Design a protein around this ligand. Structure first.
Ligand SMILES: *[C@@H]1O[C@H](CO)[C@@H](O[C@@H]2O[C@H](CO)[C@@H](O[C@@H]3O[C@H](CO[C@H]4O[C@H](CO)[C@@H](O)[C@H](O[C@H]5O[C@H](CO)[C@@H](O)[C@H](O)[C@@H]5O)[C@@H]4O)[C@@H](O)[C@H](O[C@H]4O[C@H](CO)[C@@H](O)[C@H](O)[C@@H]4O)[C@@H]3O)[C@H](O)[C@H]2NC(C)=O)[C@H](O)[C@H]1NC(C)=O
Ligand SMILES: Nc1ccn([C@@H]2O[C@H](COP(=O)(O)O)[C@@H](O)[C@H]2O)c(=O)n1
Ligand SMILES: *[C@@H]1O[C@H](CO)[C@@H](O)[C@H](O)[C@H]1NC(C)=O
Ligand SMILES: *[C@@H]1O[C@H](CO)[C@@H](O)[C@H](O)[C@H]1NC(C)=O
Ligand SMILES: [Ca+2]
Ligand SMILES: [Zn+2]
Ligand SMILES: [Zn+2]
Length: 706
């Protein structure tokens, strides 16, 4: 009986043949295996289905941005964001090197492109042999290290020979036998491009790939290793059906110009022709503003590199163009109809939260649980997972180490909460009492736990000075070094102008007085906590509850609290809200140091002001609608990192449909709670009853569009 014909067997304890000390780990990749494939065509894939049913499976695995082979395949083995590991796209360009990059190019084998540290390099430093086969980055030597067994990429090599090649390596002597293995197949990406996600060719391809895995599993059984190997069946991205009618050509707005170069696809980027002479000299801001809102329902959007949604993490690299394009699903962008390969072919590269961009992940073996279905996770988390499977100390990556502990029978690494680096001090009443020049028209422990029911945010800033200001409706962590609130937490239940009051607990700043704000300047103040809480709550009008805010952003901020926040309180039976300013001027996704903060502090209206680049907001509720936010058994989080812009060009307000464009901005700039943690230097939910590993799972979560 073949392996696929046998039923499930619990591998609680690894059954390894002699000469084996611990079960090896094989990483099997199927390029272009969209997550929807297994959902729908499970009955046509008997081998893959058994691996799903006897292992740990996830409906959707979220890939990196853009959704391309090389960036994702390399992010898997490095656990790094594409903006950090160097491989931004299949085709890209580095200004500092004056060289282009391509799959079919001599520059591909250049070690100057590959940054970070792949797993086989990690394994080599800790005396662990690795045998790879056609994995991106295996051909090139990184840090002067090459895998003990490698093969330079040759797509003409038949798949069946690749499987046998790995099977032959498994028979090598214990000292010359690798402990880590990789496998790569071009299907069903190839069939996906040429015929589309819904075709007879992909079904034949899925079945072809399915029998090939069955060949591997039968091969493992004949070697007596079917219960002695950790298998990770993964993919790089999904596949979307392209259309000729749904394609964007830049020439229609610019003309047959030759001063600009466009990297075509659903994740388009633009650089000038005179490069690197005018790579920075070219002002992209003008071109971006000239391309925005040209159509009634435009299916593309010009984005300056820092203005992209933070969830994408696609800014802090030299290779990423300062001008990018975000497109609606099923849409691609190009300069001229001649540059593109084809318009009506199967494509990928769209937003990594799109439904069809989702990838496959199945973990099978003695180390993985049997028939366990887990929630979605990013591919950068897999790197740390493999280190635990190979007994390796992981290189510094972007994955929350330990967040995938629920997949394993016996977790190797037990995570802990980050220590508080902030210098926590107290603010008593000391300075009374200045005139604000404002016109106004006519115990403690119980109120603390009510405002921060999951625990106060911990200050990971080192070594920032923060005070805790307690009110009757909210608790705010105030910064003494910046003289503004870092965060404000409050609970809003299911059913419950030009004036301000001086908070005598904080030192007075000239920007706290209402006389500072005129009706002419676009810059004003906003509240972190809405004043319309519970008559009218006056402590929300404290000076310590205001932040510098553009008038254009107040349109979004007021609608967020007056309409959406109240609706969410009814749908989710109350919500706990934590809000605050975000300062990331170097657009690296992490909080700025005091040094760079002083460099970006503008002066306006004769006063020095540090104005926020973004504003974060975390909404927390109960998973059980019968419970209020003060009595949750399990949490329901959703975070947002909203861009603080002087105008609403991104939204195309023109047409004046306010209730529509705001929510579309909210949904677009949704982010992981971890993302907020990384960018604000705060740590949430530390006093929550669930374990650290569970809390990492919660904080690294993002919803899939469509
Ligand atoms: C995802 O995960 C990845 C990996 O964990 C994160 O990427 C890492 O980000 C951090 C912070 O952004 C990076 O650290 C910085 O590295 C840069 C670059 O290093 C080089 O910079 C100069 C080259 O021209 C040069 O000055 C440096 O030379 C030495 O510098 C000092 C001298 O004493 C020494 O300590 C170094 O070891 C070097 O020998 C170097 O060649 C660097 O500029 C940064 O310096 C800042 O911080 C230091 C204090 O640490 C300070 O002194 C400086 O003034 C400056 O403020 C900093 O070290 C790191 O390189 C990234 N790692 C990788 C592999 O990419 C990423 O942050 C995560 N992303 C997200 C979104 O979370
Ligand atoms: N190491 C590797 C792995 C894949 N590739 C190529 O990358 C292609 C996949 O790219 P996309 O999915 O991004 O379009 C495969 O068809 C293959 O020919 C390569 O050139 N070198
Ligand atoms: C950059 O590369 C191009 C193409 O090879 C070359 O013609 C040009 O001379 C290079 N520019 C610089 C500054 O080296
Ligand atoms: C690629 O692989 C095929 C199949 O093994 C082989 O015939 C061919 O010679 C290889 N091409 C190159 C360039 O090595
Ligand atoms: Ca920063
Ligand atoms: Zn691919
Ligand atoms: Zn592809």
């Amino acid at each position: 009986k073949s392996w696929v014909e046998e039923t499930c067997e619990s591998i609680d304890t690894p059954e390894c043949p002699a000469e084996f000390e611990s079960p090896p780990t094989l990483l099997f990749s199927l390029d272009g295996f969209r997550a929807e494939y297994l959902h729908t065509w499970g009955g046509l894939l008997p081998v893959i289905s058994k691996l799903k049913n006897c292992g740990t499976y996830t409906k959707n695995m979220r890939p990196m941005y853009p959704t391309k082979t090389f960036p994702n395949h390399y992010s898997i083995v490095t656990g790094l964001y594409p903006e950090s590991h160097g491989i931004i796209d299949n085709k890209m360009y580095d200004p500092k090197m004056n060289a282009s990059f391509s799959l079919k190019s001599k520059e591909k084998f250049n070690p100057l492109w590959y940054k970070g540290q792949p797993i086989w390099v990690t394994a080599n430093h800790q005396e662990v042999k690795s045998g790879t086969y056609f994995w991106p980055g295996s051909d090139v030597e990184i840090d002067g290290i090459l895998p003990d067994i490698y093969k330079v990429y040759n797509g003409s090599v038949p798949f069946e020979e690749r499987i046998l090649a790995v099977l032959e390596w498994l028979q090598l002597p214990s000292h010359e036998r690798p402990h880590f293995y990789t496998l790569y197949l071009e299907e069903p990406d190839s069939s996906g491009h040429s015929h589309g996600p819904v075709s007879s060719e992909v079904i034949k391809a899925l079945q072809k790939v399915d029998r090939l895995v069955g060949m591997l599993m039968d091969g493992l059984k004949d070697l007596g290793l079917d219960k002695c190997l950790n298998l990770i069946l993964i993919s790089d991205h999904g596949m979307e059906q392209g259309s000729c009618k749904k394609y964007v050509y830049l020439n229609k707005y610019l003309g047959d110009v030759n001063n600009v170069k466009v990297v075509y696809g659903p994740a388009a980027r633009l650089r000038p022709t005179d490069v690197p002479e005018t790579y920075y000299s070219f002002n992209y801001e003008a071109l971006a503003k000239n391309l925005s809102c040209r159509e009634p329902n435009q299916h593309f959007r010009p984005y300056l590199k820092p203005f992209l949604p933070k969830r994408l993490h696609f800014a802090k690299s030299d290779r990423i163009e300062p001008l990018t394009f975000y497109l609606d699903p099923q849409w691609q962008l190009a300069l001229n109809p001649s540059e593109r390969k084809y318009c009506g072919s199967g494509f990928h590269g769209s937003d990594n939260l799109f439904s069809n961009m989702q990838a496959l992940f199945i973990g099978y073996g003695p180390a993985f649980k049997h028939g366990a279905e887990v929630d979605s996770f990013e591919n950068i988390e897999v790197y740390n997972l493999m280190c635990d499977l190979l007994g390796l100390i992981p290189a510094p990556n972007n994955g929350s180490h330990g967040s995938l502990n629920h997949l394993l029978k016996k977790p190797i690494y037990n995570p802990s909460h980050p220590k508080e680096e902030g210098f926590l001090s107290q603010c008593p009443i000391k300075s009374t009492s200045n005139d604000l020049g404002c016109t106004c028209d006519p115990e403690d422990d119980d109120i603390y736990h009510m405002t921060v029911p999951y625990g106060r945010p911990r200050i990971l800033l080192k070594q920032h000075r923060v005070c805790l200001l307690q009110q009757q409706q909210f608790l705010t962590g105030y910064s003494l070094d910046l003289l503004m609130p870092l965060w404000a937490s409050y609970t809003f239940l299911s059913n419950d102008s030009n004036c301000l009051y001086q908070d005598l607990r904080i030192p007075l700043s000239p920007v706290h007085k209402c006389s500072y704000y005129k009706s002419n300047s676009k810059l004003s103040y906003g509240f972190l906590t809405p004043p319309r809480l519970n008559h009218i709550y006056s402590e929300a009008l404290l000076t310590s509850n205001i932040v510098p805010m553009y008038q254009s952003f107040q349109v979004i901020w007021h609608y967020l609290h007056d309409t959406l926040l109240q609706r969410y309180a009814h749908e989710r039976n109350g919500i706990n809200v934590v809000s605050g300013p975000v300062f990331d001027f170097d657009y690296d996704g992490r909080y700025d140091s005091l040094e760079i903060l002083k460099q970006n502090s503008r002066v306006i209206r004769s006063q020095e002001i540090l104005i926020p680049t973004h504003f974060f907001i975390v909404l927390t509720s109960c998973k059980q609608l019968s419970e209020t936010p003060l009595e949750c058994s399990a949490l329901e989080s959703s975070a947002y990192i909203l861009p603080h812009r002087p105008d609403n060009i991104e939204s195309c307000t023109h047409g004046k449909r306010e209730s529509s464009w705001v929510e579309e901005l909210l949904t677009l700039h949704r982010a992981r709670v971890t993302d907020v943690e990384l960018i604000t230097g705060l740590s949430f939910y530390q006093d929550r009853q669930e374990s650290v590993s569970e809390l990492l799972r919660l904080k690294t979560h993002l919803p899939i569009f469509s």
